[PDB]
Amino acid sequence: TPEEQRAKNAKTILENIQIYERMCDLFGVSEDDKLIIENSISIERMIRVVTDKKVFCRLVESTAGKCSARLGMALKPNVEAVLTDVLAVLGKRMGFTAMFKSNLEEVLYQRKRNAAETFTLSQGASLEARFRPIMEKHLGVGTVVASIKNILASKKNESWSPLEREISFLNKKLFPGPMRQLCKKFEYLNDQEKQLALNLMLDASLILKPQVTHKMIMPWSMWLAVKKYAEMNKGSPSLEDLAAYSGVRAFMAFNTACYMSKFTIGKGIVGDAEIMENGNDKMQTLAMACFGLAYEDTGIVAAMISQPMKKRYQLRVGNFNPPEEGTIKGTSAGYFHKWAEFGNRLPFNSFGTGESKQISNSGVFAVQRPSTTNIQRLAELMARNTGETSDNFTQLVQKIREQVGTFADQKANLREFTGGYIYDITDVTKSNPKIPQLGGDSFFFEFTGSDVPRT
Amino acid sequence: TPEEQRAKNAKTILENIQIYERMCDLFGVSEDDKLIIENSISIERMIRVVTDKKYQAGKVFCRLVESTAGKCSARLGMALKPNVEAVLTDVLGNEAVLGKRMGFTAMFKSNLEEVLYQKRNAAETFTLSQGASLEARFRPIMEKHLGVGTVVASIKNILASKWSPLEREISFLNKKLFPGPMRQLCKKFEYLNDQEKQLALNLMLDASLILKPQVTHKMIMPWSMWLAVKKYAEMNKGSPSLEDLAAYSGVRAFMAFNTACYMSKFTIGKGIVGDAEIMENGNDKMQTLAMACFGLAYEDTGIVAAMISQPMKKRYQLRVGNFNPPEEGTIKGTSAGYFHKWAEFGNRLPFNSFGTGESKQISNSGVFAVQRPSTTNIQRLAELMARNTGETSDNFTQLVQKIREQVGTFADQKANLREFTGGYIYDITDVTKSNPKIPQLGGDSFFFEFTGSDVPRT
Amino acid sequence: TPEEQRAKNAKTILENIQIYERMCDLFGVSEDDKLIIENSISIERMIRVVTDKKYQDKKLKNKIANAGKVFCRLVESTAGKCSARLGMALKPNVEAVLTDVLGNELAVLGKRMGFTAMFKSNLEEVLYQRKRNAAETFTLSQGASLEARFRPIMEKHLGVGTVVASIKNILASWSPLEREISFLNKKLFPGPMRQLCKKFEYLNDQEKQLALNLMLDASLILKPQVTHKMIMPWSMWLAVKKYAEMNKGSPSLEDLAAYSGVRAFMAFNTACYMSKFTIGKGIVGDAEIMENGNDKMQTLAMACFGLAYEDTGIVAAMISQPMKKRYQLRVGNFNPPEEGTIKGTSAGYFHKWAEFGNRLPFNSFSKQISNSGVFAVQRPSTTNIQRLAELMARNTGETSDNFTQLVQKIREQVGTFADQKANLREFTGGYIYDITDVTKSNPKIPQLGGDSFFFEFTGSDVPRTGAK
Amino acid sequence: TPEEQRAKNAKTILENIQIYERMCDLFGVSEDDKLIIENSISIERMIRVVTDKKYQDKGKVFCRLVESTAGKCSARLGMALKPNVEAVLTDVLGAVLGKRMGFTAMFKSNLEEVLYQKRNAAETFTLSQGASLEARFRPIMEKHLGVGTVVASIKNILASKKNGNYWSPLEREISFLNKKLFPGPMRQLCKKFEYLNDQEKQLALNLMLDASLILKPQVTHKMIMPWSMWLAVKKYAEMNKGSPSLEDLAAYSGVRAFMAFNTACYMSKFTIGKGIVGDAEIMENGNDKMQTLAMACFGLAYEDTGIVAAMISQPMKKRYQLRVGNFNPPEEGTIKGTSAGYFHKWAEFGNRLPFNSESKQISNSGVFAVQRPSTTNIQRLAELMARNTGETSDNFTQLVQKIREQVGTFADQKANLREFTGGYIYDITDVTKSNPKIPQLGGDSFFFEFTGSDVP
Ligand SMILES: [Cl-]
Structure with a gap:
């Protein structure tokens, strides 16, 4: 039952709100300043550092109508004591906080062992090693490939080894066909054959899209803002009503959080330290971070938000750390006027009605007609159905190239997430499907003439 | 001679009408209720069951529709097995002939089931599974009507279960498949191992979804509808005779179907395939009937839409039941003149050209040094090279690759690929083919597409 | 030098006119009936039969006087009507006429009879589509009717299919095979097909058959290079001579003594002032339908220029009558009818002309x-993909490639040009010109489009043809 | 450092101007006539001939020069004894000489490329930058050489081994070709060139050469002018001191090079005579010769003509619409000044792989399950896989096949192919590059196209 799962989520969310509010108290954050997103980022970072098997925390304080950075200090036992009073499951909840931090950094910075152009396949790249197994389904192909490369580099200087676990993770994500067969021989390949297999599967995934799980992960501060809004506005949905990480209720949860949430505007953006931050640009960055939208088609995103969509280097946004001096600005409510489901399966597969x-x-009838065969679906079928088992490494490499070629030759007609539509935020029944008018550059990290000087 | 073949058909049709009427009497069906198609479906099935060696307690039971007024109800008819057999002997005599006539009833039933409902083949190959419902005993007789997927399923069953059955099916498949390495692989099929065999079948099956095979199509309608053709011809002097309409192809078949619909009947009840609480719609059942008789489930809906007298609906927009006798319902007449346009059957390779033109x-x-675009027909050249450049020293791996390349070559031309070039639709009154027409195609052509206008719980 | 070459052509044409007129006299053809094209076809055919010593030696072996009797079916005109007659002459008399005009040597005769055979082959191509090769390769069978003795002499005029057929006959039945392979190699589009020709003798019979059919199929897109000339019946050249003599103002015979270029079109138009053909009962296909003069005129025009396999849009833009597809034409076999009417050819049939494309069509003309x-300025790629592919066809050959590898590379070459089909252009730089534009000052491009196949079945076809 | 490097360039340019003026004096060229470009071409040629040890080892230096008598001009033979010429250069100069003469040879090659269009196929000639260079200058000017030129050098070496007529030279040339070729299997094939047999070597060279016509190679471009034009820059700068200095304009690339060319054109001169390459009876045209001069200094023969036309102040003409001679001193003719401001727009040189940025x-x-077309850039994906998915176990046949498919992939995408992404032309005053402009392209971009407006 959907309500059963929302009740389970509400329990986890209420625990996180409790931890956040009590930790903020322990570090001397006023009740009003708990709603500043920078403080949530810093508090969550501190919990992850402390709980990794006497504590200072950089924080924002509101003062004289402005904001300023302060260094909060607590006893390490008191931090642990707050967690004990409220509370594997801890790993998951902190795994999610790390994932939001990764998704924020993906928007802010493009960022090793993989080619620069594969960076849009590196979901979850910021996650520390301890959180990667827990968040495995959220990790991109590039992130797993980098971990595999790290293991191989560590070797050159148990029934289930870390490398074997990582390969199993990659196999599940990869587009079906010869790439999955190549994973099965990875252990039998030499070091150079391994490097080639990894880079080939990574390059091919830029068109043969992998399956990656997406959730709406927002800072604890924003969940706190949902709770306070729910308590204050009686006709409003409850926290359990909004306790969803996907679907329309997630969008309602984010929009509701934006009534009371806050962030800071200061001197210094990523790239130029002398340029002033812009409120709307930071809002867009926040929305993209919570939904993991850095690598998403900007046309899709633009059709769903209440502000003109901007490319990365047109945004005057900082690093979301507490600024030394600045102004506090509220988030924009109603930022998403349209919503959509997450595509957590292979994009070339169908989603929904189609x-x-x-x-x-x-x-049947001898009547002239065009061929009507769906070439994309036929190619996918043959990937799943016509596999040769006697194929060696060289042969599998070739069919991976051929598999890339057949879809590249079909690029103009290739469709991802067939049957998926955007819906108005009021349209919770999905009764009126809409299709965004796409076209033009869809890359968030494109350089433009409207870019920020020095950035 | 065309007339000789209609005369041959009329004799067979009249024998089937005799069998049907005598079986109905033996099972207590009123004369009016003989024209209910559900009763024809159930009687024809019972004949197949009785002649099936495994199951058909000395009495034979058959569910049937009975009309009380403009109302209908299901009843269980009963006859003795020797009496049912005696009727067949009386009409046909016993010494073959029965197999083909039951094969055709089985083919209609399969084509109806294909419309209503979409083991070893991948789900996406289901549009190549014409005749899939046929029991094994009827497949060799109806061989040319079977799709590539159905033959492949038979081959897979033979291989897993145990002038030869395998050679018969392989020979059948070779005739149907698009020319080229797929036919070469069929010829070497016996020399492949089990793993190679399974890959070859699935490869040839996937490729046929673009490299279309050749399948024979006929207009196969229930005996009751032929009875309706006879009754209308007898009742109306201006109507064509049964022998005039005794055709399974061409315009005369469409006229036979249209004429049968003057007097044929079906039932409207509560409960459709998918939802047991929704009421059937008469026009939706009519479309289903029309599609079943012509085997149109897998056909381009744009083609079908241009020939029928009602707006074309996708599968799951149809409020249609299983055509079994409903416990309660109303009787509805079939729609006469349902086909306002007709076409010939495409029984040859679609990528080849068809007929005149x-x-x-x-x-x-x-000849002259004048700048011009290339005018070569790439589709026809690819087919020519498929028939002309076959190598016999190619092994399994080489043939598999050439099959992928042949799929790739036609996938590259999709935008320019044409099937049944030179084939046109004609008005039902244009029996001479004097005014060829081209249907206005466009949009989704798949009968089984899910739509937003579908029936709740469907 | 163009004038020098026209002088040489005039000498040869005048020799052919003498032969024709003397054979006509020897076979009792009236002066008016010498201008009937049917009589020219029959007289030239009779010379080819008389000059075939294998066939004549066969008759000699298999009495002698009958072998010395030469019969020729001919047209006789009385007023405006015509009838068939059988002319007879003794073989020594026929040979003596050739010897008197052409001398004792009689390689000299081979080329001239090769050309007459080529016109006849080109007429049969228009009338009939054609089975050693697949039916769809018939548009590559230029010169298919030529007897074996004429094929080496007319080699450059032969299509890839015709040479392939000759090779197939040899296999089923320097060196004859090596000569034919060398002919094919020069005609074929450059690349792996030429490499395969160089290995033909090391292939077995099964590989030989596959290679031939593969090279033949690929040539339907990888167009070979074939030599084209304007070849007319001797009677039509006679008509040029008589018109030139009667009308001094008109261009001279040497002025019109060209087998290509605008002067060839001028020669054809000049021949049409006085040339004649027959209209009778019976067309190819139906023996009860009457021939139509305009339809036979189109057939004659197509035969003289070898246009059966040409894009009909090109041809339609150059002729003075609506272009008709094959099976819309009411035309007979050009043999003498038992009864019929005499019809004049139509002058001015060609209002536009063009040069012959005798080189690889994918090359430019x-x-x-x-x-x-040089400058870091954003720009589209400007490389010519068609010309790039052709260059790689000529330059990127692997020598050690075996039969199987070459077969694959031929398929890939077909595929590569098939992928470019929308942008492929043949005879780039070639244009049509008005018959008066002899300087090529005003180039024009035909508005092409629609079906370009002369042998298309249409709904407007003649009963029992395309509607059979 | 940019300004440090500009001062060093000025030192090199000033040294070359000195040599030109000293040789001019020794050969009797008047100061007015020192600015005639034909005299600069001839003096530079004579220096290359004098310093070439390969000719010497197999005693009077004669030089044909232009002499002006007011507007009119005439050819004259300058005369010096070889020891006299040899002594002057040693006195003037006292390794460095080779590079300066390599650059003079490069200008002459780029002039001949414009004027005139045997081991490489004719259609590959647009890949033969630097083809005229003598063997001694090719290693020094390696970065300036085209793929066809290096391949031709390799073919010559191989042919001398086969005939028996004669870092090894072949290894050096292969290393040169490897750096230029488009990344992927072509570079892999270069590294195995010494391990290929003779037939494979020939196939590999022609395949890499043909493929480079779409998979463009990397070639270094600099603005190389005759010494006379640099002398004209010095004279104009000093006489009009309010104008930029020589050291300010001592640049071989960027906007400063275009200004140096424009500044040189105030005082530079060339000759107009009767007789062009082709017909000896047709008169030369100043603007046609001016276009040839501009194209030579920037090596633009093989450049997109639309690109060039958008940057110059005169209508762009194709090769065979130009009435231009061989730039040797004519027996009789008229002197014409160069046109100042010929380039009203400028651009940076593309010295890196064109398909890279x-x-x-x-x-x-x-992220969202929303129906969308695939947005992946096929061109760049292919470039990535060329750089990332290289197999070392690939044999010759496999590398050849991947080269054909690499050509095929870019051919299938030609309509979407973009070269020099991010590069724009800028106004001559826009030294800031603040206002990018895009050339208005379309139609034939080939300088050597045959046209109906061509010269008899
Ligand atoms: Cl001429």
């Missing part, structure tokens, strides 16, 4:  |  | 195909 |  199994016609 | 010229040889 | 960037 | 994002990773 999921019939008919991909061809068999003619 | 084709030719063997596929290129120009330039 | 400059050598820069790419740019090397 | 632009951000590094070439794909999207979907």
